[PDB]
Amino acid sequence: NVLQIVRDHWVHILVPVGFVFGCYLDRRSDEKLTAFRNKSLLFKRELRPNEEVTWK
Amino acid sequence: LLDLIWLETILPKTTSFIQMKMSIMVSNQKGLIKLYFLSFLITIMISMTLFNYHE
Amino acid sequence: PTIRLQEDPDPEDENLYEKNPDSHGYDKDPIVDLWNMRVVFFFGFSIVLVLGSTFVAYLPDYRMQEWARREAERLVKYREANGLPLMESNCFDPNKIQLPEDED
Amino acid sequence: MNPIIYTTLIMTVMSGTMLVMISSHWLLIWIGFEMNLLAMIPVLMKNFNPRATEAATKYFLTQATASMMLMMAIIINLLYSGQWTITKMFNPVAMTMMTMALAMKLGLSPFHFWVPEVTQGISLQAGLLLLTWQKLAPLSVLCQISQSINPNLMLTMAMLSILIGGWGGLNQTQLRKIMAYSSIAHMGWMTAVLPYNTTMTILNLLIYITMTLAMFMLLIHSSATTTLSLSHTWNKMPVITSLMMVTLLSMGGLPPLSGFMPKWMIIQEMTKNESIIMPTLMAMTALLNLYFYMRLAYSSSLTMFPSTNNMKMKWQFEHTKQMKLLPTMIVLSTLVLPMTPALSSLN
Amino acid sequence: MLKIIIPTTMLLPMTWMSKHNMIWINATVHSLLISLISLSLLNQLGENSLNFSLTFFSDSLSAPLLVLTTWLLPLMLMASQSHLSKETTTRKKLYITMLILLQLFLIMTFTATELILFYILFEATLVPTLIIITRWGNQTERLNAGLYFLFYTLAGSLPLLVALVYIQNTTGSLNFLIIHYWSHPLSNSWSNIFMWLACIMAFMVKMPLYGLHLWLPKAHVEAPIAGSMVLAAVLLKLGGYGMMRITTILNPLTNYMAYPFLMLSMWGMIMTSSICLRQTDLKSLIAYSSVSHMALVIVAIMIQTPWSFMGATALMIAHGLTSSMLFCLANTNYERVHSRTMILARGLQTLLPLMATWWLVASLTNLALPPSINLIGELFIITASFSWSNITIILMGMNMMITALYSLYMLITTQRGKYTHHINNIKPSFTRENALMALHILPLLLLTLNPKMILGPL
Amino acid sequence: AKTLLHKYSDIPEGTECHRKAYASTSIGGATGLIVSAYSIALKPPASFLEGVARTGRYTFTSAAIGAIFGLTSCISAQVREKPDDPLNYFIGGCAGGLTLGARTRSYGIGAAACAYMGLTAALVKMGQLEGWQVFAEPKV
Amino acid sequence: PFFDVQKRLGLDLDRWMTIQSAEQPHKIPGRCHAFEKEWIECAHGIGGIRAEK
Amino acid sequence: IARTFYDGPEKNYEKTMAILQIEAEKAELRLKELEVRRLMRARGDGPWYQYPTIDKALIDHSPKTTPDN
Amino acid sequence: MTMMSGRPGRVPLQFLPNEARSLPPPKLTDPRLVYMGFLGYCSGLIDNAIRRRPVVSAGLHRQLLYVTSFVFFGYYLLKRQDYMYALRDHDMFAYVKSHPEDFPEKDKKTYGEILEEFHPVR
Ligand SMILES: CCCCCCCCCCCCCCCCCC(=O)OC[C@H](COP(=O)([O-])OCC(O)COP(=O)([O-])OC[C@@H](COC(=O)CCCCCCCCCCCCCCCCC)OC(=O)CCCCCCCCCCCCCCCCC)OC(=O)CCCCCCCCCCCCCCCCC
């Protein structure tokens, strides 16, 4: 019977899906501005024995 | 005196009046080729003297 | 015809309370009306208002007010201990500034 | 008219324009103009009536005078330099005559009077052709001889065209005359930036052509030539009036619509040179075109005008002929601003 | 900050794919969720801004404005569904589409990093507002109002555009961070004076400045209720935000270019407050109130001090909420009696007590009763003006006396006295209207509880 | 032509007011003659003598406006000893506007012409001072 | 504006008649053949702006 | 709240540094392009603003029935 | 003025010189290509609306062809635009390199040696 319920209330995932996609695109945008990661004079730091990058 | 009359009078009403008068002046032609071909002759002579003689 | 045009008469306004004495003023459909009331009240007061106020009230100190207060406390302690003036009229060291050679 | 003969005449018009566009010899350019005019005259007279005959006669007189001045300028240039190649136009008097002849062909002010009359006297299809395809050849020649232009004369004519287009369009209830005055103003905008950057001229021409095609096709779809007949369209097909309203807003130059892109670009180009006062004047003047576009939008889409009883019968029938390029034309007329940098491909 | 932009763009097809009798519910629910998401932008730093990408950034000045926009959308939806009941489904969806597009344009306007992108979005906000006014307004004057709304704006903004591109040819950038870091003084020449005027007049006509304000009573009276809400609450603040952004490149010319505008603002604040005392239309009174408060904001921006900037930010937020609430309160009576004349329906406290309480609270916030954020902004601006010149306390003082008068006048005319005998169609207040009033007023006092969130970057 | 413009502009601001007034009068007369030519072409006057009357009216109006502007601007510059000041041009423009208003016998025309012509003349003076170009030569 | 169809296809639709120093019938020379030839050879390939000086 | 919804200040700091570098480089490039355009249009010695001249390949280098051309 | 018409070596009607093959092609997920596909989808929806057909469901093959054609043209348009901008940058850098007298790198001064006027705000 979920067919009618789905075809009546499938418009309720558009905005949450848009929120998730916007978060993903913001992370992708952050990925393109790492030219000074761990390179500023104020925050330059030696890496821990395990961690690869200071922030993502 | 101010908000309903003079502030209306200076900026928007004057602009509307001027644009309407210029529209009436520009658009009201009889459609006779004689008149604006004479206008073309005047334009050609003026463009030959004012802009062309000075190079 | 002594008329100017064929037009519908202006209709009277409908009272939502006539067909629904407890009508909430959202819709003429009583069920849609009730659920509109419910969603407005739940997502406006219960979610955004109270939870948003709580979230804003406990926002972490990214404005660095407490950090600045602690730094000022350390500075005042040090300067009062060594007898230096609490603040200097110059915020930049003059040895790093080169004035113009001639003022005449 | 026979469909075969009509196709042949349209092909001859296009062939004359193409000959103008591909020629290196001034004589061949003049021949292209002659052939274009000869084939264009009967196309304006396709639906025979006194108004069409009057429009064709006025058009012929204007274009023949322009072509005579064109040939005289060519011959003067040859006299002072034995050159036939379209180039920097070694003589200034010949260059002035050439500029005046091309402006008369384009309908720039003050050689603007014939455009509203010819547009009003012909059918909507002929008006579409006249206001879109007929601008290509003179603008191509002007782009080729731009380095020798006298900026004072062309800028004067462009500013006059913008002013006169706005003022004349303010007074019109006939849709064809509104389109003609809009065309005059847009030609003024196109020629204002020509001495500085021909790529901007091409971009403005392309956007104007797209918007004009969408406008004329929407006007043909709803058989309206007056404001009052267009005010009935909402009671037959509201989608057409809504698309028309958005297209009018774009033609008015409002952001974020596509019609804002050329003016913006042109203004920027003019500030790369010094040229500060003229762009400000041009924008403030284009506000007039926006005003009468908005009045048309008020009449046709934003309010509902009274209708007639017989309109009920029109509800029972559908449009037979369908324009295949109308949706793409509307989309390109409205939603193209985000792709502005693609103008680099024009140069 | 695509996590806010994309959900609104998703509101668009969600509205256009909804069932005919679920459009309001879905739009309201997801608008409220988007407001809740946008609440996270209030976490700001003390040194610089949140630089999300090359295109968008958030400051301590724009974040409360974004929160106000996203919160105003559901209130507009709630206020609109009463008078649009007879409308067809497609036209209702088109109206909601206009509201959503306006929100999207405002959200992108408040966060654009470049001045030309800001200009493009700040002009793009014009189209949905004009369509709403001229298509869903009630009287024949709306058409004229639309024209007054359009050209008054464009005649200010077309010069600005020119100036903007000119600046980009001189400094090489319109990025706001680059503009701030590479700032250079403006010399005293005629060219610089006209550049200053081109950079200032568009925002001046947006506020609006006294003398350039005639479009506002027309547009805000002839518009439907949601149009008036968004015009008073958010669209007037575009001018103030743009002025506070653009003034970073105008020093030290402002030091003397502000005098005519300061004189106009102070005297016209007195004048519009006086006009409010003799007004027969209830909506026009609220519009002229907006003009007076915006004159205060203009003075604060023009004197260019940290206290004045904080006061301007607080006053813009407080005025947005208060004026939107007042417009909704007037709309309830208009929907009951179909007339905007203030003296037509009187003694409404006897018939509608809770609505009378809402009226009292709204008029109390209008006259800036302490410790409301209205009063905080007004007092900060007055203190900064006193530092600028001790004589200003005269004019400001007079304003404080007049405002309360007309404010209470409005209340006393509508709620007190005896009811009109022949008006027998005043039905009890609906739950929707009471909820609308509460959702307006509670955030005001909650913001009073924590005022540093609306005090700006200074 | 530009010969009249050069004849007017070669004389310094606050010197030889009679010559500057004469040059301004010539410029105004030329403008009025062009205006009358276009008016007669587009609006025929139905009689040769009527055409002469219209030409004389337009030309005299324009020449009077130019003469008043030039004389008043030069005299103001010389009395104030302040050349390169747009106020002199504003005063001359308002004087020309009032002359136009008296010529047409209309108070509203006089006031509007005073304001607009004064503002335009002051703007022109600012342009001469700062080097503003109306017809910018192509640079890039 | 100018679509150089002749250059792209190598057709020579009208270039044969552009200048007087180009392959006349029976090798009949123009009155100013040498002067035009010298000017053309001077100005070839450097552009109009440089050639004008 | 900090652990769940936000990052540390270093991320925003260094992203700001990268954004500022990109924007400053773009501004310098715009100014340089304007200067290059001005010089190229003034002198005509660069790839830009090259206006056509007559092709020298059109000349007939044959005897011309007269020794002096 | 025409900047690039007479650039030496330019083939008249090529639309894509061989040199452009040395540039990285646009990705198939380029946001500009996505916007071109969005324009095609809008064209299909408007086509449905004008023809009085159900806007979203009427012709799926027609809408697919609309989107495909817009994307197909947009790919080559983007390639040509990127090539033109690369050409502009190449020419600018070569010209700056070949005329060092017109582009001097002057000595750098720190802010501790530059005298800037202070304008108080009061
Ligand atoms: C955002 C905040 C607000 C901003 C905007 C709001 C405020 C501004 C807008 C409101 C005011 C602007 C209105 C401007 C004038 C309007 C006239 C008009 O519309 O004409 C159409 C209208 C249509 O008439 P019509 O169809 O042509 O013929 C029928 C006539 O009505 C039948 O006429 P009639 O036979 O009955 O008699 C007419 C006759 C005589 O009229 C009469 O019969 C009665 C007497 C009235 C004349 C009063 C003059 C003597 C008293 C003045 C005392 C000093 C002034 C106060 C300042 C004190 C300084 C400490 O008048 C004349 O002959 C004119 C001769 C010129 C003398 C007066 C002009 C002086 C100009 C002021 C100079 C100020 C310089 C700056 C000072 C700085 C220090 C503060 O004309 C009139 O009816 C009115 C005629 C008299 C108006 C002139 C009065 C001037 C008022 C002061 C102007 C200040 C503002 C402009 C300054 C900026 C310009 C660069």
Ligand SMILES: CCCCCCCCCCCCCCCCCC(=O)OC[C@H](COP(=O)([O-])OCC(O)COP(=O)([O-])OC[C@@H](COC(=O)CCCCCCCCCCCCCCCCC)OC(=O)CCCCCCCCCCCCCCCCC)OC(=O)CCCCCCCCCCCCCCCCC
């Ligand atoms: C900026 C960010 C991005 C924004 C992009 C730009 C905006 C959106 C794109 C624009 C183009 C798209 C739509 C074009 C075709 C629409 C034409 C139409 O008539 O629509 C009717 C049509 C309903 O017709 P129906 O279903 O067959 O049955 C109803 C009858 O036909 C009943 O029909 P009727 O004809 O009998 O009803 C008469 C009605 C018919 O008149 C109209 O419907 C007006 C439509 C005009 C089309 C717009 C003009 C051209 C585009 C330029 C837009 C400029 C935008 C820039 C800002 C400036 C604003 C102007 O006329 C009136 O009632 C007069 C009202 C007067 C108001 C005048 C205002 C009109 C201009 C407003 C335009 C605003 C933008 C579009 C609004 C949405 C329209 C659906 O609407 C739709 O349902 C289609 C829209 C929704 C489909 C898309 C959904 C995608 C799939 C869902 C999942 C999403 C995937 C997400 C991925 C993640 C996976 C989970």
Ligand SMILES: CCCCCCCCCCCCCCCCC[C@@H](O)O[C@H](CO[C@H](O)CCCCCCCCCCCCCCC)COP(=O)(O)OCC[N+](C)(C)C
């Ligand atoms: C209805 C409300 C609309 C909005 C209000 C907008 C307000 C705009 C007002 C502009 C404020 C000042 C503008 C320019 C600053 C000074 C103006 C001038 O009066 O001051 C003197 C200028 O001297 C003289 O006054 C010359 C100017 C006179 C001509 C201007 C015309 C003003 C007349 C009034 C016309 C109304 C304008 C508004 C139309 C609506 C100062 O002497 P000076 O040191 O040498 O000039 C400084 C500039 N320098 C250094 C480059 C030389």
Ligand SMILES: CCCCCCCCCCCCCCCCC[C@@H](O)O[C@H](CO[C@H](O)CCCCCCCCCCCCCCC)COP(=O)(O)OCC[N+](C)(C)C
């Ligand atoms: C309003 C929207 C505008 C859209 C306009 C119509 C779009 C569809 C038309 C499709 C164009 C077909 C051309 C593809 C076939 C190859 C032809 C090629 O050989 O021509 C080249 C020319 O390439 C074309 O110019 C490129 C056409 C692309 C135009 C699009 C730019 C529009 C501006 C940005 C707005 C966004 C557009 C979005 C597209 C849907 C040769 O260059 P060249 O012979 O040496 O130039 C001669 C003229 N010169 C020398 C004076 C310059």
Ligand SMILES: CCCCCCCC/C=C\CCCCCCCC(=O)O[C@H](COC(=O)CCCCCCC/C=C/CCCCCCCC)COP(=O)(O)OCCN
């Ligand atoms: C509804 C009412 C709204 C009214 C708003 C309109 C008023 C806006 C102010 C006027 C805009 C003019 C500025 C244009 C852009 C300025 C950019 C600039 O800086 O250019 C200057 C040049 O400045 C100018 O040329 C501008 C001169 C003015 C020409 C246009 C006049 C418009 C009307 C002027 C009076 C009105 C202004 C105030 C009106 C207030 C609102 C009523 C520098 O150029 P350069 O040549 O390189 O200088 C150094 C080398 N010589």
